[PDB]
Amino acid sequence: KISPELLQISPEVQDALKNKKPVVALESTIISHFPQNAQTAIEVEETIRKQGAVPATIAIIGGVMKVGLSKEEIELLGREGHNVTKVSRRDLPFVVAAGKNGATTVASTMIIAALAGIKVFATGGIGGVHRGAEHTFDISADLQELANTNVTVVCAGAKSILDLGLTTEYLETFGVPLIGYQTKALPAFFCRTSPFDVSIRLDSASEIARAMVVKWQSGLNGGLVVANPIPEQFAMPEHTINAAIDQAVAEAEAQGVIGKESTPFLLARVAELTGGDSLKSNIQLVFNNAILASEIAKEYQRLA
Amino acid sequence: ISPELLQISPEVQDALKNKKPVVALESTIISHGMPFPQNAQTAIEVEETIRKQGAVPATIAIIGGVMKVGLSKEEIELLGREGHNVTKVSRRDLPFVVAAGKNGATTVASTMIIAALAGIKVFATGGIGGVHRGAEHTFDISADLQELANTNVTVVCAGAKSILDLGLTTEYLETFGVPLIGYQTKALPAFFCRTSPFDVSIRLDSASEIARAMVVKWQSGLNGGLVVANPIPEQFAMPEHTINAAIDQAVAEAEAGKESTPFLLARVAELTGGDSLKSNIQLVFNNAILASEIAKEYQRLA
Amino acid sequence: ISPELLQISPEVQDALKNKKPVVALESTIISHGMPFPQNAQTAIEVEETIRKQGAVPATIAIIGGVMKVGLSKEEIELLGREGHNVTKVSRRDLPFVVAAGKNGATTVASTMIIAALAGIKVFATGGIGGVHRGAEHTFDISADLQELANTNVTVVCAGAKSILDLGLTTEYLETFGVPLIGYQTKALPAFFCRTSPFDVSIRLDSASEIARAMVVKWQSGLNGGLVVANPIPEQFAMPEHTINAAIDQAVAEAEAQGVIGKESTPFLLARVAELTGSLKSNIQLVFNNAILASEIAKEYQRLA
Ligand SMILES: [Mn+2]
Ligand SMILES: [Mn+2]
Ligand SMILES: [Mn+2]
C-alpha cells in the first residue's frame, strides 16, 4: 500500500491486473542511453499487444515511479535522452525524492514491477559478473535483484560483454533458476550459443509459468532468468562479435571506464566496431523476448 | 502452503502438533548411498536411532512432485531403488522437480528449505558445502552457504570437507553472520578428521547451550541458520596429518575446473584409504544423536 | 522482544515516546578505542555533542547479557575500564554473548541491528568496515557490508576505515544496492583524509535531502541501510601522503605477522596510530559525524 505520490500505475494496467489479463513489464534504460528510441519502445509495446498481452513500460517521471507510460512520457524520456539518470536500486530513492526523471535498469524495473504485482518482464540482456571481477568485484546489482525479487526476466541471456562463466556460478550460489528456452546452451546475447549451459532447459511457456507458480507458492523468493536465443537469422557470427567485444573490453580497461558507465560504453563501442550490426541484433532479440514474455505472461495468468 | 505442493507425514504431523522434538534428514543419503537395499536399510536405521533418542525423525524428499516431510518405508525404498537415477535437488532445481512431478533427493540447502516450511529447526547431515579451492577465480561457492545465511535451521554436521577451501569458507560464514559452533571443540572438524587448521566461531559443550543460543538468536530477529560442527567419533576418525598430506599431494598433482573437486576427492580417497561413504554414514548417525539432543532442548526452551 | 533481551534506557524511551530525534552510538570505540579514563570521557563527550545539537544520544552495548539501548555513565565507565577484556560483538557473536550473560562492545553491524530493534534510524560512527586489502584472495569482507545491505539504518561515517580496499568496498556496496551518499562531496572521503580516488554514489548537500531520501527508500520497500560519508573537518585532516605511508606500513606488516580475522582492524588502527603516532583526527571525525547525524535525525523525525 504505497503512496500514490511515489507510485502510479496506468489506468489500462490497473484494469488489466484487476481482470487478470497478462501484463509484460518493460525497462526504460533501453529508451534512454531520438526520435528512434521512442518509436521503437512504442512498437515493442505494440508487439506485446499483438501477442495478446498488455505492455507496461516502467520509468520514473517527475519523481514518480510509473508503471505504464503515455506516449508523451515515452517521448519525454526519448528526447531528454542521455540527460536521464540510469537508475539502479541505490539510485531509486534519490531520483524519486528529487522529483526527477529516470530510466530503470533491470534491477529497478524488477523492483517496480514487483510493487505493481507484475511477474513477467521482457528485456534485452541482464547484467552480470564483469570480466575481471575476480579482482575488481564489479558485479551487477541485477544479480542480487534476481536473488531477491519475484519477477521472471526474459532476456537473451546475460549481455555477452560480461564474464558468462562467473555469472552462471553466481546465479547458482544465490539459487536463481537459469532457464534455457528450447536450449541447453546459455545464449550469448548477440549469439545463440555459448560455452556455458543453463540450469534447466524448458521447451514451453506453459512449463515456465507452472514453475513460477510452484516456486512462489513454495515461498522461494527471488526471480527467474529465462534465456531466449536470438533468432538465427539475426544472430551475429561468433568470431566477428567476439573480436569486437574483446577489443571494446580491452579499451574500457585501458580508459578506466568503471561502474554504471561500463555497459553503455561497451555496447556503444561494439556497435561502432560492427558498423551498427550488433545494435540491429540487439533490437531483434528484444522483440523476440517480448513475444516469449507475452506467452509466459498468458500462461502464468492462466495457471494463477 | 498447499497439500499438493507439500505433505507432512502423520507421524511428523503428530510430533509437530504436540511439540515433540523433530529432526530433519536429507534424502541424498538414500539415493547416493550404498547399493540397495542397504541405502534404504541404513536410512531406516538412522530414523530408528533418532526415535531411540526420544526424537521424531523427518526424512525429507520430493516424491512424485510433492515435497515430503517424513517418509514412509516404501518411499525410502523407492529412493534407494531408483538410486543414482534420482536427481539431487538444489534451491534453483526445486520448483522444476515439483512442477514436473519428478522424484528427487534433497540437498543440504533444499532440506533446510523444506524443513523450515515444516517448522523444523534442527537438521542432521554428514557435511555442508562450502567455498571451493580456486573459487577466488572460479566463483564456485556452494549455495548451502547462502541457505545458511537466510534460513532458520541448525545444521549438525562434521563441518565441510577439507577438500574445499576452509579458510575462505570460514570467512564467508563470518561475512554473512552465520554462527559456526564447535561441539566440544575449538578446532573446526572436517569430515574424516576431528580437527583442521581453522577454528569455529565459538565452542559450546552442550546441546542445551546450543539450544539456548538458537532461542536468543531467533527471538532477537537474527534470521539465518547455524552450523554445529560435530567431530566424527574417534573410532571412525582419520589423522589430520595424513589427510592434509594427501590433500596437499592431490592439489599439487591437479596443478599439472569442474573436475577439480571430485578429482581431489577420489585422489585423497586413494592415498589415505579413507572411504567417503562409510565415514559419511558414521557422521550421520553421530550427528543424528547430537541433533536429537539439541531438538529436545530447543523444544524445552521455546 | 522480551525485556530480558533488550532494554531501552529511560532517556531514550522518553525520546522515542515523545518523538524526539535519537542518534545511536557504538560501544566498540569505547572499549577498544583508547585507555581509561580517556575512553569513557570521550564517549560521554560524544553523547553531549549530540545533546547540544538538540538530539538524544543512545550508546548501545551488551551489558550483563542484555542488549542496552542508551547507557548510564556507570556502564560507559564499566566498558571503558574493561577495555579489551570486553568481547567485540558481531552478528554471529550476539546470540552467544547474550545467552552467556556477558558484557560486549557492539560493532557497526551489531549496533545497526540493535538500533533497528529499537526503532532508531540514525547511527553515528567513525568509519564503517569494508572489503579488506587482499580480499580478492582472502574473502575477508566485513559483515558491516551485509548489515548495510539488509538493515534499515543510516550510518554516518568518515567513509570506510582507511586501512581497507576502498575500490572493492564501493563495488560491493553497489552490487548490494546500498546508497553511498557523500555529504557535500562527490569524492569518497577516506577516514583521516577528506578525499580519495573513488566516488560516492550520490552527492547530497543537506541533511534535509538525506532524510527525505530515507523516507522514500523505506516507504518504497527497499530495505537496507544508507552510508553517509562525511569528510573530516579540514583542521583535523591528515595529508594523503603521510597517512598513506603509515597505513601502507601497517598493512604490509599485518600481512607479515599474518593477522587475519576480527583482530585485523584493531591491530591495524593500533600500528598506524603508533606510526602517526591520528588519534586526534579520529576523535574529531567522530564528533563531526555525531553533529551531522543529529541533523539527519532531526530532519528524519520531522518527516516520520
Ligand atoms: Mn558495475
Ligand atoms: Mn558449485
Ligand atoms: Mn574480517
Side-chain angles (χ1 to χ4, degrees), chain A residues 2-17 19 22-29 32 35-38 40-41 43-49 51-70 73-74 76-78 81 84-99 101-209 211-231 233-237 239-252 254-260 262-279 281-302 304, chain B residues 1-3 5-12 15-18 21-28 30-31 33-37 39-40 42-44 46-47 49-51 53-67 69-72 75-76 79-80 83-84 86-101 103-160 162 164-185 187-211 213-233 236-242 244-248 250 252-254 256-257 262-264 266-267 269 272-276 279-280 282-292 294-295 297-302, chain C residues 1-3 5-16 18 20-72 74-81 83-101 103-162 164-233 236-241 243-246 250 252-254 256 258 261 264-266 270 273 277-278 281-304:
Chain A
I2 173 178
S3 172
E5 302 185 274
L6 307 177
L7 175 71
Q8 291 169 16
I9 304 162
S10 80
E12 190 191 2
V13 175
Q14 283 183 48
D15 206 271
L17 291 174
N19 295 285
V23 176
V24 176
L26 298 166
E27 78 189 42
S28 45
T29 198
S32 304
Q36 88 97 251
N37 38 31
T40 298
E43 56 208 60
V44 173
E45 290 196 358
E46 289 169 349
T47 295
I48 292 163
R49 299 184 175 280
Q51 286 314 310
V54 173
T57 299
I58 292 175
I60 305 160
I61 307 299
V64 180
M65 295 179 281
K66 288 190 162 294
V67 176
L69 295 184
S70 49
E73 291 166 330
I74 303 178
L76 183 54
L77 301 154
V84 177
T85 299
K86 172 178 167 174
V87 177
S88 199
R89 168 178 276 268
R90 61 166 196 183
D91 311 295
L92 187 50
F94 305 91
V95 177
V96 170
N101 300 313
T104 51
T105 56
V106 160
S108 60
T109 302
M110 291 175 70
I111 287 162
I112 299 159
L115 292 174
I118 301 172
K119 298 311 210 306
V120 176
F121 164 21
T123 188
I126 59 166
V129 179
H130 290 247
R131 302 188 187 171
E134 69 278 1
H135 60 88
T136 70
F137 283 12
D138 186 354
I139 296 177
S140 184
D142 290 356
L143 303 183
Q144 283 300 314
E145 210 61 54
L146 282 159
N148 297 305
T149 301
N150 296 1
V151 172
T152 290
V153 178
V154 183
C155 59
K159 296 193 171 71
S160 49
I161 55 174
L162 302 167
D163 185 317
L164 300 186
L166 298 183
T167 299
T168 59
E169 295 294 337
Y170 197 99
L171 288 176
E172 185 182 2
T173 302
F174 284 89
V176 177
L178 174 57
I179 296 160
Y181 177 72
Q182 307 181 345
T183 180
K184 192 185 296 282
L186 169 65
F189 195 63
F190 298 120
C191 313
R192 292 190 55 97
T193 66
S194 86
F196 315 89
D197 298 326
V198 300
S199 82
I200 184 176
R201 165 176 178 163
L202 292 171
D203 294 345
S204 74
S206 178
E207 290 163 283
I208 295 167
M212 288 160 61
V213 171
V214 168
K215 176 172 164 46
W216 296 323
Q217 288 192 359
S218 304
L220 301 180
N221 293 322
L224 297 80
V225 180
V226 174
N228 184 31
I230 187 170
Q233 55 276 33
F234 314 122
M236 293 281 81
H239 168 54
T240 297
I241 196 51
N242 280 335
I245 290 171
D246 288 353
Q247 178 178 332
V249 170
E251 295 174 343
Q255 290 170 41
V257 181
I258 71 168
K260 294 191 308 188
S262 300
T263 289
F265 174 99
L266 294 167
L267 293 177
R269 181 54 166 156
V270 165
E272 269 184 16
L273 295 179
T274 65
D277 289 337
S278 66
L279 183 57
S281 285
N282 201 332
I283 294 164
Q284 291 310 323
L285 67 81
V286 167
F287 292 143
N288 196 42
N289 299 341
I291 297 172
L292 181 56
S294 296
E295 293 302 325
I296 296 166
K298 292 190 288 184
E299 297 293 333
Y300 176 81
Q301 289 296 68
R302 195 186 60 106
Chain B
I1 168 182
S2 171
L5 297 188
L6 173 61
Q7 287 183 236
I8 304 175
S9 74
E11 184 191 12
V12 178
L16 277 44
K17 282 146 64 177
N18 290 309
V22 170
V23 172
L25 297 171
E26 69 176 299
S27 32
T28 84
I30 314 161
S31 61
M34 294 292 298
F36 179 114
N39 50 12
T42 279
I44 298 293
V46 179
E47 293 197 339
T49 281
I50 293 176
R51 296 203 188 76
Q53 206 66 19
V56 181
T59 297
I60 285 172
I62 299 174
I63 304 305
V66 184
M67 293 174 287
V69 180
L71 304 175
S72 62
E75 277 161 341
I76 282 185
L79 296 164
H84 295 180
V86 186
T87 176
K88 297 185 185 184
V89 184
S90 66
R91 166 174 281 266
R92 60 169 201 185
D93 300 319
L94 191 38
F96 310 92
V97 179
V98 168
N103 296 321
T106 51
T107 72
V108 162
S110 61
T111 300
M112 286 174 72
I113 289 165
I114 298 173
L117 292 170
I120 298 165
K121 305 289 186 197
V122 183
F123 168 26
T125 190
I128 64 171
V131 179
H132 289 251
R133 296 168 178 260
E136 68 269 14
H137 60 265
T138 68
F139 278 22
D140 188 357
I141 299 175
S142 174
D144 293 355
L145 302 179
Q146 278 305 314
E147 210 64 52
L148 283 169
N150 297 307
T151 299
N152 296 3
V153 171
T154 289
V155 185
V156 182
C157 56
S162 46
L164 299 173
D165 192 312
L166 295 184
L168 300 183
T169 299
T170 59
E171 294 290 342
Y172 196 95
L173 288 170
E174 181 181 3
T175 297
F176 284 88
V178 179
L180 177 50
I181 294 161
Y183 180 69
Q184 303 187 345
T185 182
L188 172 61
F191 199 76
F192 285 141
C193 324
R194 294 184 53 95
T195 66
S196 81
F198 305 94
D199 294 326
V200 300
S201 69
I202 183 174
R203 172 182 169 155
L204 294 172
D205 288 40
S206 58
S208 64
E209 278 308 283
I210 294 169
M214 287 162 57
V215 172
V216 173
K217 179 166 160 49
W218 294 321
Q219 283 182 0
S220 299
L222 308 172
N223 292 310
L226 296 85
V227 186
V228 173
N230 190 24
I232 187 166
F236 313 114
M238 193 136 310
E240 187 193 332
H241 75 258
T242 89
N244 291 347
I247 168 53
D248 288 343
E253 294 177 350
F263 172 91
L264 294 174
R267 190 54 179 157
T272 73
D275 188 324
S276 291
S279 287
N280 195 65
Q282 293 311 319
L283 288 176
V284 168
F285 282 106
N286 201 37
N287 296 335
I289 292 161
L290 177 51
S292 298
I294 298 172
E297 294 317 308
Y298 180 80
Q299 201 69 59
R300 175 175 63 88
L301 288 157
Chain C
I1 171 177
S2 165
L5 305 187
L6 176 83
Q7 288 169 21
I8 302 178
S9 76
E11 188 189 7
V12 181
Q13 298 197 48
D14 167 86
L16 292 177
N18 291 124
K20 304 182 175 183
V22 173
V23 173
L25 296 167
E26 75 204 291
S27 39
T28 199
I29 183 52
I30 303 180
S31 290
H32 306 69
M34 83 196 78
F36 177 88
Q38 289 81 13
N39 52 17
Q41 303 177 351
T42 301
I44 274 65
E45 283 177 15
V46 182
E47 296 198 338
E48 293 302 337
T49 296
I50 292 162
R51 293 189 189 95
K52 178 176 169 175
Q53 294 306 299
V56 177
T59 299
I60 291 168
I62 301 124
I63 308 291
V66 171
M67 293 176 284
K68 292 219 162 185
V69 180
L71 297 182
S72 66
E74 293 62 38
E75 289 170 332
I76 289 178
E77 289 177 348
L78 179 68
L79 297 166
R81 279 180 193 278
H84 309 74
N85 295 347
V86 178
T87 170
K88 166 186 171 174
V89 182
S90 71
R91 167 178 274 266
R92 57 156 201 198
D93 300 320
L94 206 49
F96 310 92
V97 176
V98 172
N103 299 324
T106 46
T107 61
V108 167
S110 292
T111 304
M112 289 173 71
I113 289 164
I114 294 158
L117 284 173
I120 299 172
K121 299 295 185 200
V122 180
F123 164 24
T125 182
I128 62 166
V131 178
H132 289 253
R133 302 186 183 185
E136 69 274 16
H137 59 88
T138 67
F139 282 15
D140 184 3
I141 297 169
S142 177
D144 286 357
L145 298 182
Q146 278 304 311
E147 206 65 50
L148 282 158
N150 298 311
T151 295
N152 295 4
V153 175
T154 291
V155 180
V156 187
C157 62
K161 294 177 179 78
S162 49
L164 299 160
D165 189 314
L166 301 186
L168 294 187
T169 302
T170 60
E171 292 287 348
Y172 197 96
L173 288 168
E174 180 178 2
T175 301
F176 286 87
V178 180
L180 177 49
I181 299 164
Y183 180 71
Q184 308 181 344
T185 181
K186 178 58 161 181
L188 167 63
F191 208 71
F192 312 102
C193 308
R194 290 179 55 87
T195 199
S196 74
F198 307 97
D199 295 359
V200 300
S201 74
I202 187 170
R203 170 180 175 147
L204 291 177
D205 296 336
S206 74
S208 172
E209 281 162 291
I210 295 173
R212 171 175 38 96
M214 293 161 63
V215 169
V216 165
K217 171 175 166 47
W218 295 322
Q219 279 187 357
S220 300
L222 305 180
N223 292 316
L226 294 82
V227 179
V228 173
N230 187 31
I232 187 180
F236 309 109
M238 297 184 80
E240 296 227 331
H241 68 278
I243 194 54
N244 273 4
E253 303 180 353
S264 302
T265 293
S278 143
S281 294
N282 198 335
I283 294 168
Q284 295 297 326
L285 67 84
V286 173
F287 285 133
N288 196 41
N289 295 342
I291 294 171
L292 176 61
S294 293
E295 290 301 308
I296 296 165
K298 296 194 296 187
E299 293 294 331
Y300 177 82
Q301 186 62 64
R302 170 176 183 272
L303 307 174

PDB file of all heavy atoms in Angstrom, chain B residues 171 174-175, chain C residues 88 92 130 132 139-143 164 260-265, ligand 3, unseen atoms left out:
ATOM      1  N   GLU B 171      35.660 -17.456   6.411  1.00  0.00           N
ATOM      2  CA  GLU B 171      35.477 -16.022   6.145  1.00  0.00           C
ATOM      3  C   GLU B 171      34.057 -15.735   5.617  1.00  0.00           C
ATOM      4  O   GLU B 171      33.393 -14.776   6.027  1.00  0.00           O
ATOM      5  CB  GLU B 171      36.526 -15.514   5.140  1.00  0.00           C
ATOM      6  CG  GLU B 171      37.962 -15.542   5.660  1.00  0.00           C
ATOM      7  CD  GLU B 171      38.221 -14.498   6.743  1.00  0.00           C
ATOM      8  OE1 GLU B 171      37.429 -13.530   6.862  1.00  0.00           O
ATOM      9  OE2 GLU B 171      39.218 -14.645   7.476  1.00  0.00           O
ATOM     10  N   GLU B 174      31.519 -15.763   8.238  1.00  0.00           N
ATOM     11  CA  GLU B 174      31.567 -14.579   9.097  1.00  0.00           C
ATOM     12  C   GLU B 174      30.885 -13.378   8.417  1.00  0.00           C
ATOM     13  O   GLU B 174      30.089 -12.660   9.032  1.00  0.00           O
ATOM     14  CB  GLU B 174      33.002 -14.223   9.480  1.00  0.00           C
ATOM     15  CG  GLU B 174      33.088 -13.010  10.395  1.00  0.00           C
ATOM     16  CD  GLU B 174      34.506 -12.633  10.773  1.00  0.00           C
ATOM     17  OE1 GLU B 174      35.454 -13.273  10.280  1.00  0.00           O
ATOM     18  OE2 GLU B 174      34.672 -11.680  11.554  1.00  0.00           O
ATOM     19  N   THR B 175      31.189 -13.177   7.138  1.00  0.00           N
ATOM     20  CA  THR B 175      30.631 -12.044   6.394  1.00  0.00           C
ATOM     21  C   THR B 175      29.102 -12.066   6.409  1.00  0.00           C
ATOM     22  O   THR B 175      28.452 -11.031   6.539  1.00  0.00           O
ATOM     23  CB  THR B 175      31.136 -12.039   4.943  1.00  0.00           C
ATOM     24  OG1 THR B 175      32.565 -11.858   4.952  1.00  0.00           O
ATOM     25  CG2 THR B 175      30.456 -10.919   4.155  1.00  0.00           C
TER      26      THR B 175
ATOM     27  N   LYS C  88      34.388  -8.103  21.377  1.00  0.00           N
ATOM     28  CA  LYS C  88      33.855  -7.359  20.250  1.00  0.00           C
ATOM     29  C   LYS C  88      32.739  -8.212  19.637  1.00  0.00           C
ATOM     30  O   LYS C  88      32.958  -9.356  19.264  1.00  0.00           O
ATOM     31  CB  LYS C  88      34.976  -7.092  19.249  1.00  0.00           C
ATOM     32  CG  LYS C  88      34.532  -6.620  17.880  1.00  0.00           C
ATOM     33  CD  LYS C  88      35.741  -6.531  16.949  1.00  0.00           C
ATOM     34  CE  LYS C  88      35.349  -6.266  15.504  1.00  0.00           C
ATOM     35  NZ  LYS C  88      36.550  -6.040  14.644  1.00  0.00           N
ATOM     36  N   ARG C  92      27.189 -12.676  14.289  1.00  0.00           N
ATOM     37  CA  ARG C  92      27.261 -14.096  14.631  1.00  0.00           C
ATOM     38  C   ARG C  92      27.648 -14.334  16.104  1.00  0.00           C
ATOM     39  O   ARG C  92      27.491 -15.442  16.607  1.00  0.00           O
ATOM     40  CB  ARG C  92      28.198 -14.853  13.681  1.00  0.00           C
ATOM     41  CG  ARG C  92      29.595 -14.286  13.670  1.00  0.00           C
ATOM     42  CD  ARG C  92      30.645 -15.291  13.243  1.00  0.00           C
ATOM     43  NE  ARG C  92      31.950 -14.841  13.723  1.00  0.00           N
ATOM     44  CZ  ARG C  92      33.115 -15.274  13.258  1.00  0.00           C
ATOM     45  NH1 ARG C  92      33.145 -16.188  12.291  1.00  0.00           N
ATOM     46  NH2 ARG C  92      34.248 -14.794  13.772  1.00  0.00           N
ATOM     47  N   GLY C 130      34.698  -2.761   5.823  1.00  0.00           N
ATOM     48  CA  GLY C 130      34.616  -2.876   4.373  1.00  0.00           C
ATOM     49  C   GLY C 130      35.328  -4.111   3.860  1.00  0.00           C
ATOM     50  O   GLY C 130      35.493  -5.098   4.572  1.00  0.00           O
ATOM     51  N   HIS C 132      38.542  -5.915   2.870  1.00  0.00           N
ATOM     52  CA  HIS C 132      39.932  -5.789   3.253  1.00  0.00           C
ATOM     53  C   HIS C 132      40.862  -5.863   2.066  1.00  0.00           C
ATOM     54  O   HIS C 132      40.554  -6.493   1.048  1.00  0.00           O
ATOM     55  CB  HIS C 132      40.289  -6.844   4.310  1.00  0.00           C
ATOM     56  CG  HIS C 132      39.660  -6.572   5.639  1.00  0.00           C
ATOM     57  ND1 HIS C 132      40.381  -6.117   6.724  1.00  0.00           N
ATOM     58  CD2 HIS C 132      38.371  -6.637   6.045  1.00  0.00           C
ATOM     59  CE1 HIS C 132      39.565  -5.936   7.746  1.00  0.00           C
ATOM     60  NE2 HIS C 132      38.337  -6.245   7.362  1.00  0.00           N
ATOM     61  N   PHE C 139      38.894 -13.480   0.862  1.00  0.00           N
ATOM     62  CA  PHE C 139      37.488 -13.293   1.181  1.00  0.00           C
ATOM     63  C   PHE C 139      37.261 -12.544   2.502  1.00  0.00           C
ATOM     64  O   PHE C 139      36.193 -12.665   3.095  1.00  0.00           O
ATOM     65  CB  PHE C 139      36.732 -14.632   1.207  1.00  0.00           C
ATOM     66  CG  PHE C 139      36.394 -15.169  -0.159  1.00  0.00           C
ATOM     67  CD1 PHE C 139      37.004 -14.659  -1.292  1.00  0.00           C
ATOM     68  CD2 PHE C 139      35.453 -16.179  -0.307  1.00  0.00           C
ATOM     69  CE1 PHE C 139      36.695 -15.157  -2.555  1.00  0.00           C
ATOM     70  CE2 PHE C 139      35.145 -16.687  -1.567  1.00  0.00           C
ATOM     71  CZ  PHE C 139      35.767 -16.173  -2.691  1.00  0.00           C
ATOM     72  N   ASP C 140      38.202 -11.707   2.933  1.00  0.00           N
ATOM     73  CA  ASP C 140      37.976 -11.047   4.219  1.00  0.00           C
ATOM     74  C   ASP C 140      37.185  -9.766   3.950  1.00  0.00           C
ATOM     75  O   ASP C 140      37.707  -8.736   3.494  1.00  0.00           O
ATOM     76  CB  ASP C 140      39.302 -10.739   4.924  1.00  0.00           C
ATOM     77  CG  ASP C 140      39.104 -10.128   6.312  1.00  0.00           C
ATOM     78  OD1 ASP C 140      37.937 -10.006   6.738  1.00  0.00           O
ATOM     79  OD2 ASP C 140      40.111  -9.758   6.960  1.00  0.00           O
ATOM     80  N   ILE C 141      35.905  -9.852   4.277  1.00  0.00           N
ATOM     81  CA  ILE C 141      34.933  -8.825   3.961  1.00  0.00           C
ATOM     82  C   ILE C 141      34.072  -8.591   5.187  1.00  0.00           C
ATOM     83  O   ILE C 141      33.439  -9.511   5.688  1.00  0.00           O
ATOM     84  CB  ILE C 141      34.028  -9.254   2.778  1.00  0.00           C
ATOM     85  CG1 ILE C 141      34.876  -9.439   1.510  1.00  0.00           C
ATOM     86  CG2 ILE C 141      32.886  -8.249   2.591  1.00  0.00           C
ATOM     87  CD1 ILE C 141      34.148 -10.095   0.362  1.00  0.00           C
ATOM     88  N   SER C 142      34.067  -7.363   5.682  1.00  0.00           N
ATOM     89  CA  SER C 142      33.343  -7.048   6.902  1.00  0.00           C
ATOM     90  C   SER C 142      31.855  -7.352   6.802  1.00  0.00           C
ATOM     91  O   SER C 142      31.202  -7.011   5.809  1.00  0.00           O
ATOM     92  CB  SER C 142      33.517  -5.563   7.257  1.00  0.00           C
ATOM     93  OG  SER C 142      32.746  -5.248   8.399  1.00  0.00           O
ATOM     94  N   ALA C 143      31.324  -7.975   7.854  1.00  0.00           N
ATOM     95  CA  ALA C 143      29.892  -8.229   7.976  1.00  0.00           C
ATOM     96  C   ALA C 143      29.098  -6.924   8.027  1.00  0.00           C
ATOM     97  O   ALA C 143      27.872  -6.914   7.818  1.00  0.00           O
ATOM     98  CB  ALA C 143      29.613  -9.077   9.220  1.00  0.00           C
ATOM     99  N   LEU C 164      41.416  -0.183   4.599  1.00  0.00           N
ATOM    100  CA  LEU C 164      40.680  -1.142   3.771  1.00  0.00           C
ATOM    101  C   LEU C 164      40.874  -0.936   2.260  1.00  0.00           C
ATOM    102  O   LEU C 164      41.567  -0.019   1.841  1.00  0.00           O
ATOM    103  CB  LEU C 164      39.207  -1.044   4.123  1.00  0.00           C
ATOM    104  CG  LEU C 164      38.871  -1.376   5.572  1.00  0.00           C
ATOM    105  CD1 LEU C 164      37.515  -0.795   5.976  1.00  0.00           C
ATOM    106  CD2 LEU C 164      38.911  -2.889   5.765  1.00  0.00           C
ATOM    107  N   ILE C 260      44.732 -12.311  10.641  1.00  0.00           N
ATOM    108  CA  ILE C 260      43.551 -12.405   9.789  1.00  0.00           C
ATOM    109  C   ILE C 260      42.330 -12.823  10.604  1.00  0.00           C
ATOM    110  O   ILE C 260      42.301 -13.916  11.174  1.00  0.00           O
ATOM    111  CB  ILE C 260      43.766 -13.413   8.642  1.00  0.00           C
ATOM    112  N   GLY C 261      41.322 -11.957  10.649  1.00  0.00           N
ATOM    113  CA  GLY C 261      40.144 -12.206  11.460  1.00  0.00           C
ATOM    114  C   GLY C 261      39.508 -10.908  11.913  1.00  0.00           C
ATOM    115  O   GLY C 261      39.643  -9.881  11.250  1.00  0.00           O
ATOM    116  N   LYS C 262      38.802 -10.953  13.038  1.00  0.00           N
ATOM    117  CA  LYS C 262      38.251  -9.742  13.642  1.00  0.00           C
ATOM    118  C   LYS C 262      39.320  -8.887  14.342  1.00  0.00           C
ATOM    119  O   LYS C 262      39.070  -7.728  14.674  1.00  0.00           O
ATOM    120  CB  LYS C 262      37.126 -10.093  14.623  1.00  0.00           C
ATOM    121  N   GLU C 263      40.505  -9.457  14.557  1.00  0.00           N
ATOM    122  CA  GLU C 263      41.601  -8.748  15.230  1.00  0.00           C
ATOM    123  C   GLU C 263      42.362  -7.819  14.273  1.00  0.00           C
ATOM    124  O   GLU C 263      43.228  -7.035  14.691  1.00  0.00           O
ATOM    125  CB  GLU C 263      42.568  -9.746  15.888  1.00  0.00           C
ATOM    126  N   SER C 264      42.015  -7.906  12.991  1.00  0.00           N
ATOM    127  CA  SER C 264      42.682  -7.155  11.931  1.00  0.00           C
ATOM    128  C   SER C 264      42.528  -5.635  12.059  1.00  0.00           C
ATOM    129  O   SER C 264      43.513  -4.902  12.013  1.00  0.00           O
ATOM    130  CB  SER C 264      42.178  -7.624  10.562  1.00  0.00           C
ATOM    131  OG  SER C 264      42.417  -9.013  10.398  1.00  0.00           O
ATOM    132  N   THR C 265      41.295  -5.162  12.207  1.00  0.00           N
ATOM    133  CA  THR C 265      41.055  -3.729  12.347  1.00  0.00           C
ATOM    134  C   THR C 265      41.726  -3.167  13.609  1.00  0.00           C
ATOM    135  O   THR C 265      42.437  -2.158  13.547  1.00  0.00           O
ATOM    136  CB  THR C 265      39.544  -3.399  12.334  1.00  0.00           C
ATOM    137  OG1 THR C 265      39.010  -3.675  11.031  1.00  0.00           O
ATOM    138  CG2 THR C 265      39.301  -1.933  12.677  1.00  0.00           C
TER     139      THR C 265
HETATM  140 MN    MN D   3      37.029  -9.818   8.815  1.00  0.00          MN
END
